Amino acid sequence: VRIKLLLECTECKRRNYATEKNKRNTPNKLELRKYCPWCRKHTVHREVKI
Template structure:
């Protein structure tokens, strides 16, 4: 009788433990997948090759390389900035 009682407590603890751990694992999994999808990129000036800007992009939504017309402070004019990787 005592054995069944102890077993019952152990089983209840196990159920509780899973109840707490499972959402935690799920959250960790979602966080990890989000981290992989969004990556930091640098915008490099097409003329002087300096990296003037940093931004982020979601690889799931945007597959092609980003290009922006942005101000280059070194040349003091607007030039085409292309996406490059940050080390």
């Protein structure tokens, strides 16, 4: 449910994608998790948009 909602992280250094979920209710300030983009190896990743 929206409270857990749905959000998507994106790499820095222009765009890139990967799909995830949140939990605003739970102490979830902001997210900057570490993943891998289509282009190149594992790098950064920032959370943004619905």
